[PDB]
Design a protein around this ligand. Structure first.
Ligand SMILES: [Mg+2]
Ligand SMILES: [Mg+2]
Ligand SMILES: [Mg+2]
Ligand SMILES: [Mg+2]
Ligand SMILES: [Mg+2]
Ligand SMILES: [Mg+2]
Ligand SMILES: [Mg+2]
Ligand SMILES: [Mg+2]
Ligand SMILES: [Mg+2]
Ligand SMILES: [Mg+2]
Ligand SMILES: [Mg+2]
Ligand SMILES: [Mg+2]
Ligand SMILES: [Mg+2]
Ligand SMILES: [Mg+2]
Lengths: 188, 260, 57
RNA sequence: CCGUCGCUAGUACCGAUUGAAUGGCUUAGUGAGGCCUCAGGAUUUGCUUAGAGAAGGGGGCAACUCCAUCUCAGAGCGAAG
RNA sequence: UGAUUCAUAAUAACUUUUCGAAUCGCAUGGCCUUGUGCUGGCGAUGGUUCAUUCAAAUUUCUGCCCUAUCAACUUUCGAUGGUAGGAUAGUGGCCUACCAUGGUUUCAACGGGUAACGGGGAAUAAGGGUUCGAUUCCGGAGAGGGAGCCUGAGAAACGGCU
RNA sequence: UGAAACUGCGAAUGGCUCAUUAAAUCAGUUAUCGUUUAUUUGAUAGUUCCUUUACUACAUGGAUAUCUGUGGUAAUUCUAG
């Protein structure tokens, strides 16, 4: 029904291409998922070659990742903070790929407390040595720290949840992060 | 149309079957196997039109069921199993061991091979990749995939496969001046040495190849198969031995050799 | 009209044709998946308990 | 031999009828039916030790020398629907 | 490899944790720690991504019959391109958002007609040609029309459904 | 031995027809480093465990059809208990 035909689309010039054949299944495109954040729901869809393809619906949670540390966690999402394609996805609050979001962050904090164990926002004798050996490696780019303190880390989700089902993304760092922040500021 | 096509019409059937234009509507569609439809040979065509050990399709089927046929070690029961180039068909009653090898004209010649040679299969190299768990594996243009090949077995080389075990006896490196057998188009079935290799970035690597008669010809790399070193081929080739004579010459041969 | 009565454990069941309308009138405006008594349905059935499930227009 | 005006046939041309018909596009309004979707929950059951009558309801009066025990009021927790 | 963010292998997590043989026919072997113990043959089917084969969608280049009594068309309702998303098995204005104003055209765009399915080929036959090709082969469409979808590896199937 | 039925697979091939369709289809030619691919033959998974002093294995569960029975209908390759 909803097709991906280049049969329709007039032409490069403009001539109205007549309806050559009734559109096929292999040309199809399904209805959009546009996953929100409100109770965990998934529906698969039997695609071409069989092959299930999990559609995220109202997806809560997902493993958002650090770059500097090289880690990710069983972490909740809060809200759709800024989506750069369309702002209608921020009113309705529809999570998607490369939409900027705020991350529960508690899990991250916990992990840090194991990893380095110096705390963000503001025992045992040989493990002390280990701790000493670690830490003072990554100083973190201020904004991130603030987010951590808040309980709301700025990420960009990069799993396509309408295709994958999972809602796994990326803690924002550096220049891109800054840009995103700026955009957010402009919006608000 | 609407999915995979299941028939093969007798005119649309590939010519190197050498089928009758007449005598039924269809030809046997060679099923999914280790060889490409048109570059294959089904077990009906072999046991009916070539050998004539079966007078008809039913007979062939019966023979298959009896399980004296073995294409490459394993048994086979499918009428239309595509036995292709280099495949060794052994009929255990008769002991008529065959290797499917091309004639100079192009069609598959019935090569009545000995029992000791009909044992291995020479086969080309289509790919060299690594699979899961970091294991390097070679692929053959003649069907098989063999795990763990001698690191210096690269693409378009040839490989003597033990066949019974399905391993690697030996290999020939593709290079200048190494006996080669042809499997494509106008030069299909000839045999030669290899002179050049026109490299060409993307668009088909050519190969200038001379035969025993010093007659040059060119083919694409995919249409060439390395059969040995000049003088010593690794397989017994049929009468003619990939020479391919001129028409006039052929005629002369025909009308000189009148031995009643 | 007709009735379609079946016992589970014994595995024995029967036709009960009912031309008398009063008897029929017990089941009106019930729904598939409910319980019924024996005595109101007829004089032959007394003490029994039907379970209304299934039927046909 | 050329025109006008006559008679007899036929071809097309224009042409009021607010003509008629078929199809192709098409405004506005409606909008069947499925697909996803928000819910919705007929029914089907598992696991909970949840008290039985049970006549060795685990190898001889007894929390059976208590057995996937006799089995429904449980109710909780699901899964499918 | 002509060429990669390739093959592929590690570190990190998530996962409404896929898969990981409570499977059917013959045959009934080998060690005694003499239990019926531990053991082992010929096969069937399934099941993972990688091959292959059968294929599959697209896709590059070049090539169509008549018409100016069709010279502008496309672009409100995607036209051309971008960026991002969405979707798709995947590429892609395929769809959405935001922006730019492109894109095609007398080397006939666009429109109209075809008593046009395309090609292999057919008839004619000095050479060049001209006409025909519904029709045994290859492709493509369609199953009264138009729409929509289930199942399925593969259908927008019509000897399936709505 | 085997009716019936559930599971499997097949029914998307083939056959027909030429209505549309004029850079569309189609012809040769490339490409998928741009993808799916039952079937095919080749391949192949000690890590399911989650603190490690008493725990599901020489075989786990309840269904549903054939049937047999209780039927409706004016009827339909109709199917309710
Ligand atoms: Mg698959
Ligand atoms: Mg290439
Ligand atoms: Mg990679
Ligand atoms: Mg894109
Ligand atoms: Mg024509
Ligand atoms: Mg037509
Ligand atoms: Mg034609
Ligand atoms: Mg016609
Ligand atoms: Mg045809
Ligand atoms: Mg008709
Ligand atoms: Mg249809
Ligand atoms: Mg019919
Ligand atoms: Mg059909
Ligand atoms: Mg067909």
């Amino acid at each position: 029904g909803i097709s991906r035909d280049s049969r329709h689309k007039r032409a490069a010039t403009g001539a109205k291409r007549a309806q050559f054949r009734k559109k096929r299944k292999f040309e199809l495109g399904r209805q959009a998922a546009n996953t929100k954040i409100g109770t965990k729901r998934i529906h698969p869809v039997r695609t071409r070659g069989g092959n299930q393809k999990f559609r995220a619906l109202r997806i809560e949670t997902g493993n958002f990742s650090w770059a500097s540390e090289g880690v990710a966690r069983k972490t909740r999402i809060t809200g759709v903070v800024y989506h750069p394609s369309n702002n209608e996805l921020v009113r309705t609050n529809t999570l998607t790929k490369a939409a900027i979001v705020q991350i529960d962050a508690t899990p991250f904090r916990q992990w840090y407390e194991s990893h380095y164990g110096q705390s963000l926002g503001k025992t045992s004798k040989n493990t002390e040595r280990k701790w000493a050996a670690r830490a003072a490696e990554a100083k973190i780019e201020h904004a991130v720290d603030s987010q951590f303190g808040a309980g709301r880390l700025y990420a960009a989700i990069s799993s396509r949840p309408g295709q994958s089902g999972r809602c796994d993304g990326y803690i924002l760092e550096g220049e891109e992060l800054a840009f995103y922040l700026r955009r957010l500021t402009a919006k608000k | 149309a609407r999915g995979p096509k299941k028939h093969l019409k007798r005119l649309a059937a590939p010519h190197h079957w050498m089928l009758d234009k007449l005598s039924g509507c269809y030809a046997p569609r060679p099923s999914a196997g280790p060889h490409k439809l048109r570059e294959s040979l089904p077990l009906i065509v072999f046991l009916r039109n070539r050998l004539k050990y079966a007078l008809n399709g039913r007979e062939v089927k019966a023979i298959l069921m009896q399980r004296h046929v073995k294409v490459d070690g394993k048994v086979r029961t499918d009428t239309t199993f595509p036995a292709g180039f280099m495949d060794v068909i052994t009929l255990e009653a008769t002991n008529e061991n065959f290797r499917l090898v091309y004639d100079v004209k192009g069609r598959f010649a019935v090569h009545r091979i000995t029992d000791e040679e009909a044992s291995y299969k020479l086969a080309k190299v289509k790919k060299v990749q690594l699979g899961k768990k970091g294991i390097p594996y070679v692929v053959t243009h003649d069907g098989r995939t063999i795990r763990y090949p001698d690191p210096n077995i690269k693409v378009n080389d040839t490989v003597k496969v033990d066949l019974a075990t399905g391993t690697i006896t030996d290999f020939i490196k593709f290079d200048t001046g190494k006996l080669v057998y042809v499997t494509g188009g106008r030069n299909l079935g000839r045999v030669g040495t290899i002179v050049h290799r026109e490299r060409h970035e993307g668009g088909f690597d050519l190969v200038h190849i001379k035969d025993s008669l010093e007659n040059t010809f060119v083919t694409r790399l995919n249409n060439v198969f390395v059969i040995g070193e000049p003088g010593r081929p690794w397989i017994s080739l049929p009468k003619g031995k990939g020479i391919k004579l001129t028409i006039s010459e052929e005629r002369d041969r025909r009308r000189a050799q009148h031995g009643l | 009209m007709k009735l379609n009565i079946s016992y589970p454990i014994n595995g024995t069941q029967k036709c009960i044709e009912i031309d008398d309308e009063h008897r029929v009138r017990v089941f009106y405006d019930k729904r598939i998946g409910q319980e019924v008594d024996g005595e109101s349905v007829g004089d032959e059935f007394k003490g029994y308990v039907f379970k209304i499930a299934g039927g046909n227009d």
